[PDB]
Amino acid sequence: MFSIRKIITISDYVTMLNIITGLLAILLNSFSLIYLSIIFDSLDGYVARKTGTVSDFGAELDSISDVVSFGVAPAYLLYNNFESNLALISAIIFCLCGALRLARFGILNVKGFIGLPIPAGALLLVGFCQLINSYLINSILAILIGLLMISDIKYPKYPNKIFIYIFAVSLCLAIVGIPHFALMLCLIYAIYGIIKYIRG
Amino acid sequence: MFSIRKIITISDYVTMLNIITGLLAILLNSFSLIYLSIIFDSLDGYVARKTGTVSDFGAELDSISDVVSFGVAPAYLLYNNFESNLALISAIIFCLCGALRLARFGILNVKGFIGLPIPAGALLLVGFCQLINSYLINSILAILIGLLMISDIKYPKYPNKIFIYIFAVSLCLAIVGIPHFALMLCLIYAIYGIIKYIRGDL
Ligand SMILES: CCCCCCCC/C=C/CCCCCCCC(=O)OC[C@H](O)CO
Ligand SMILES: CCCCCCCC/C=C/CCCCCCCC(=O)OC[C@H](O)CO
Ligand SMILES: CCCCCCCC/C=C/CCCCCCCC(=O)OC[C@H](O)CO
Ligand SMILES: CCCCCCCC/C=C\CCCCCCCC(=O)OC[C@H](O)CO
Ligand SMILES: CCCCCCCC/C=C\CCCCCCCC(=O)OC[C@H](O)CO
Ligand SMILES: CCCCCCCC/C=C\CCCCCCCC(=O)OC[C@H](O)CO
Ligand SMILES: [Ca+2]
Ligand SMILES: [Ca+2]
Ligand SMILES: [Cl-]
Ligand SMILES: [Cl-]
Ligand SMILES: [Cl-]
Ligand SMILES: [Cl-]
Ligand SMILES: [Mg+2]
Ligand SMILES: [Mg+2]
Ligand code: NA
Ligand code: NA
Numbered sequence: 001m002f003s004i005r006k007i008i009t010i011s012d013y014v015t016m017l018n019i020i021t022g023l024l025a026i027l028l029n030s031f032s033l034i035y036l037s038i039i040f041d042s043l044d045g046y047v048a049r050k051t052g053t054v055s056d057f058g059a060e061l062d063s064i065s066d067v068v069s070f071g072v073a074p075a076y077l078l079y080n081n082f083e084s085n086l087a088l089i090s091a092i093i094f095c096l097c098g099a100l101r102l103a104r105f106g107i108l109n110v111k112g113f114i115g116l117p118i119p120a121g122a123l124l125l126v127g128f129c130q131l132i133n134s135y136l137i138n139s140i141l142a143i144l145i146g147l148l149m150i151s152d153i154k155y156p157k158y159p160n161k162i163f164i165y166i167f168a169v170s171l172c173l174a175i176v177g178i179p180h181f182a183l184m185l186c187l188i189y190a191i192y193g194i195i196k197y198i199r200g
Numbered sequence: 201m202f203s204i205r206k207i208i209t210i211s212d213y214v215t216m217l218n219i220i221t222g223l224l225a226i227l228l229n230s231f232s233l234i235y236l237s238i239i240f241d242s243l244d245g246y247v248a249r250k251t252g253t254v255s256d257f258g259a260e261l262d263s264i265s266d267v268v269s270f271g272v273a274p275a276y277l278l279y280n281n282f283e284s285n286l287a288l289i290s291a292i293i294f295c296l297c298g299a300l301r302l303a304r305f306g307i308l309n310v311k312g313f314i315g316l317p318i319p320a321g322a323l324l325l326v327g328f329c330q331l332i333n334s335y336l337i338n339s340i341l342a343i344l345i346g347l348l349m350i351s352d353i354k355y356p357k358y359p360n361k362i363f364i365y366i367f368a369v370s371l372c373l374a375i376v377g378i379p380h381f382a383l384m385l386c387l388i389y390a391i392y393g394i395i396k397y398i399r400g401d402l
Contacts, residue, residue, distance in 0.1 A: 076227065
């Protein structure tokens with residue numbers, strides 16, 4: 001008897017792949033698997049709305065996967081690959097800002113985002129932890145990226161299919177070892193949110 | 201810039217504390233911080249009802265803290281301290297069964313618990329990881345607990361002061377290195393559900 005098998009759907013199958021990849025990045029110390037987790041997290045919602053398998057269980061499961069993949073894993077990667085007392089303070093602040101902004105997203109039903117979304121925060125931190133070899137610098141970004149995440153800066157979701165693929169190609173290049181394009185499209189998407197907010 | 205400061209209550213800070221210790225358990229590779237997490241997870245609720253700060257922003261943050269403290273960390277503490285191709289396969293199944301039953305707990309407003317609760321499943325795996333020094337036994341227990349956590353075995357929630365006090369007393373003993381009493385309680389509480397699932401229906 002496992003009645004939980006009744007509410008599991010095809011979209012939840014992709015979400016569990018997103019959980020596995022996020023937890024595997026923690027266990028295997030892989031920055032690359034975080035890039036695979038962004039591909040999954042940007043797809044399972046599209047997969048849900050395509051097969052009609054949208055559910056509150058899948059929505060809750062969608063954010064549980066964000067916790068593992070884009071909240072704990074990037075904080076772990078930052079500390080495990082930059083062992084310091086500065087980085088430990090920053091990994092905590094980064095993870096707490098992820099939990100807080102995911103608790104806000106859980107009670108909201110808006111098209112866009114309130115504050116920088118947690119996948120864009122992970123891609124920034126992880127991509128910065130892959131290109132910069134600095135305990136001090138990467139710790140300041142994590143705190144900066146964290147404060148962006150619990151802010152009121154509105155960000156657009158526009159999950160139109162071409163936008164996902166364009167984002168995903170850079171993630172495919174990021175997985176194989178060139179995150180410069182994944183990081184370029186993220187820093188542009190980040191400051192774009194700033195300007196549209198400061199402009200009004 | 202931070203309208204999140206308006207919706208954060210005093211009980212949320214106890215949840216913020218449970219996130220810090222659960223994450224410090226992963227980073228510092230600490231079995232003891234999981235036991236301190238189970239105490240925090242028992243009180244952030246209690247504070248919320250006691251101080252009337254029950255909120256959907258706090259219920260969300262409550263589930264988020266369970267993933268870090270009792271989903272990822274027991275899986276990490278298992279694989280890290282028992283590195284093998286198999287503690288990897290079991291820690292994945294454990295953390296996956298935790299996410300499935302936490303996503304079900306979110307859609308359900310039932311009085312008790314459907315399946316073994318994730319703090320109890322974590323304590324069982326964590327307490328066993330401290331007592332049994334075997335890649336094999338701890339990997340199987342993760343399977344059995346994981347299957348228990350996604351099962352339909354109804355587990356009761358009786359969060360009164362006296363009950364929370366007894367469990368937290370043993371958890372303090374687990375914090376300082378004697379987890380045999382929180383382990384014995386969690387074994388009794390786990391099998392108690394299997395008996396009541398078997399003995400009666402309604
Ligand atoms: C309001 C704030 C409340 C916050 C309350 C939570 C307190 C956080 C405790 C952290 C202890 C961390 C233990 C430090 C372990 C450091 C291990 C280490 O590696 O440091 C050595 C260095 O990296 C070699 O160069
Ligand atoms: C309540 C939560 C806040 C945290 C409360 C604790 C405050 C931390 C104080 C540290 C100073 C202790 C004196 C040691 C000086 C720092 C040592 C150091 O900076 O590095 C270590 C050295 O490099 C070898 O690893
Ligand atoms: C229903 C069947 C499922 C449940 C069956 C599993 C329960 C069996 C008990 C296991 C713990 C016994 C541990 C025996 C050894 C403990 C003493 C010891 O060596 O501890 C090491 C030391 O504490 C290092 O810190
Ligand atoms: C898994 C992707 C599935 C899609 C297939 C696409 C091809 C790319 C495959 C593997 C990329 C390499 C993975 C990198 C694994 C490295 C593990 C690690 O330990 O990371 C070291 C890092 O440098 C910390 O310092
Ligand atoms: C469009 C005409 C009007 C604007 C004209 C201005 C030129 C803008 C274009 C590029 C600027 C360079 C931006 C940074 C590009 C870095 C690309 C790179 O170096 O990637 C190498 C790869 O990562 C190996 O590992
Ligand atoms: C049904 C679940 C499948 C698993 C079966 C559960 C029942 C096994 C009970 C105890 C095993 C303890 C024996 C294995 C460990 C030796 C005892 C021990 O931990 O000693 C400490 C170690 O030698 C130094 O740290
Ligand atoms: Ca998603
Ligand atoms: Ca709680
Ligand atoms: Cl949001
Ligand atoms: Cl988010
Ligand atoms: Cl439940
Ligand atoms: Cl639970
Ligand atoms: Mg997700
Ligand atoms: Mg919790
Ligand atoms: Na779904
Ligand atoms: Na609250």
